Design a protein around this nucleic acid. Structure first.
Lengths: 41, 234, 89, 50, 39
RNA sequence: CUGAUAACUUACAGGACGCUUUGGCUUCAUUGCUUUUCAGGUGAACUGCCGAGUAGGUAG
DNA sequence: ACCTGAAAAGCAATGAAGCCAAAGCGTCCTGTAAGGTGA
DNA sequence: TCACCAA
């Protein structure tokens, strides 16, 4: 049984609003929030 | 008077220079190479007589290869051992007492310490002689090697060796001569009808010069109780 | 008389294929290849004695010869561990 | 560091001019006014601990 | 008898999908892939 | 005339399964770039003729 | 027809660089060949 | 010809 779904969203946020992705497991200023990321183009 | 032999590339030599140390092959092997190169040319010109030889090593690569010994009589192989070998690419600058191209190439010797030594055909252009050491050393190509100079530091022990092997991590010890055990006598079976004595190896430390011309050139020195290939500068 | 040669082969292999160099005889890694330093790389080589055994596969002069054998005293075969030209023959 | 004057800073060497750099934003000459725009969200995150 | 083949395949995976190569034997990463060098 | 002479290390192979880094945030106060400055080599290629021709032709 | 691109001085001080929790278990590492002396 | 022998 195989059943592949292709899902796609559409978010309407306020003006100039904030978006929150997942963030990495980190192993004179230290980064307090490092995002997970992929290379597109 | 300084005849230049470039890129003498030995494929499979021996690294067991002594029964004690492994590394670059012994310096009675580089001497016996040249005195076979002399003694061939004494078929035509009976007064050739190399005096000393400058060694410029590139690319050692010591490695444990194998040695399949030949079947010997019940017919099976002999006992299995372990053998270290090295693949030297050196270049050699002689010092002659005073010759075509094709006289030199056919009178090259073909083994440097069990290994086949060859010059490539395209490198035959560089066998020409000169008169001054400063041009003969600027003459040969593939410049990036160390000349062999003996480390004449008082020593008596292996800790004397290993202490000098860390201040210079490029210092390499090997066999430099043969320390005898009795006086040479007449035996009924001897190597080529000469006087035979039993010897033991002599281990010295060997420098590397960037470039004292006499110190760089090596020669055979006979001591009433040993025989050591020293530089001229000792 | 001297007669130097300088031989150069050119092998067109399949995609991404194996090569089989000669490999060492010592006493962990179970297939250790022989190597030499060319430039700054390790490179697999074929031996100076692995080569010379291939130039000297000549012997088909034995009493029952169906294949050439490497030239040697009591000429041995290493496919089947036997001595053609055994000394009792 | 204490408060007595340094004797190297003479009258001539302290009237010497001191060049620097800033960013400088201003309204263009023929403009009328300036907009400024953003958005606030009021949420109920305080009801229970995260 | 020699008979050399040259196989080539073509995979149409879903959007942003996962591909599973072979992975190494080791004696802290818990999944180390086998690799080569192409370009 | 080299710890000399001679020297085939071989054959076979599945590393896998699972995995939410998250929460909070005011960079900012101050300021004079000035003073002065020759691109020249233009005596060469003229003066008529036809045509409505500011186009275009022609003589020596 | 070629030739020229000026000198003279300066580049500010003050303060801070948060934490807290963890790092998985089951199972294995192959076999065949190659002896010198003495009764 | 075979009984001898280790890390």
């Amino acid at each position: 049984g195989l059943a592949i779904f292709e899902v796609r969203a559409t978010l309407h946020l306020p003006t100039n609003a904030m978006v929150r992705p997942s963030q990495v497991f980190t192993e004179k200023t230290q980064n307090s929030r490092v995002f997970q990321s992929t290379t597109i183009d | 008077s300084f005849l230049v032999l470039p890129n003498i590339r030995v494929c499979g030599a021996t690294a067991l220079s002594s029964p004690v140390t492994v590394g670059i092959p012994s310096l009675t092997a580089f001497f016996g190479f040249v005195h076979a190169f002399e003694r061939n040319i004494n078929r035509t010109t009976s007064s050739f007589r190399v005096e000393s030889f400058a060694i410029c090593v590139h690319q050692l690569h010591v490695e444990k290869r194998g040695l399949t010994a030949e079947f010997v009589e019940t017919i099976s192989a002999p006992a299995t051992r372990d053998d270290w070998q090295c693949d030297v690419v050196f270049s050699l600058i002689l010092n002659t007492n005073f010759i075509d191209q094709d006289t030199l190439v056919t009178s090259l010797p073909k083994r440097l310490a069990r290994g086949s030594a060859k010059i490539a055909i395209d490198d035959f252009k560089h066998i020409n002689s000169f008169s001054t050491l400063e041009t003969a050393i600027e003459s040969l190509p593939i410049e990036a090697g160390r000349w062999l100079s003996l480390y004449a530091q008082s020593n008596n022990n292996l800790s004397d060796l290993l202490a000098a092997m860390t201040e210079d991590h490029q210092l390499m010890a090997s066999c430099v001569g043969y320390h005898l055990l009795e006086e040479p006598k007449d035996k009924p079976n001897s190597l080529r009808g000469y006087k035979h004595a039993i010897a033991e190896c002599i281990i010295g430390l060997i420098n590397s010069i960037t470039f004292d011309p006499n110190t760089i050139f090596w020669s055979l020195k006979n001591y009433q109780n040993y025989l050591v290939v020293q530089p001229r500068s000792i | 008389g001297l007669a130097i040669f300088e031989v150069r082969a050119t092998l067109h292999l399949p995609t991404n294929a194996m090569v089989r160099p000669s490999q060492v005889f010592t006493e962990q890694n179970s297939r250790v290849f022989q190597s030499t330093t060319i430039d700054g790389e390790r490179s697999p080589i074929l031996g100076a004695f692995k080569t010379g055994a291939a130039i000297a596969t000549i012997d088909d002069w034995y009493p029952e010869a169906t294949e050439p054998l490497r030239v040697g005293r009591f000429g041995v075969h290493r496919e089947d561990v036997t001595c053609y030209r055994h000394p009792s023959t | 560091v204490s408060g007595q004057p340094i004797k190297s800073a003479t009258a001539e060497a302290l009237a010497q001019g001191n060049p620097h750099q800033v960013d400088f934003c201003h309204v263009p000459y023929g403009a009328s006014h300036i907009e400024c725009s953003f958005s606030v969200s009021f949420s109920s995150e305080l009801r229970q601990p995260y």
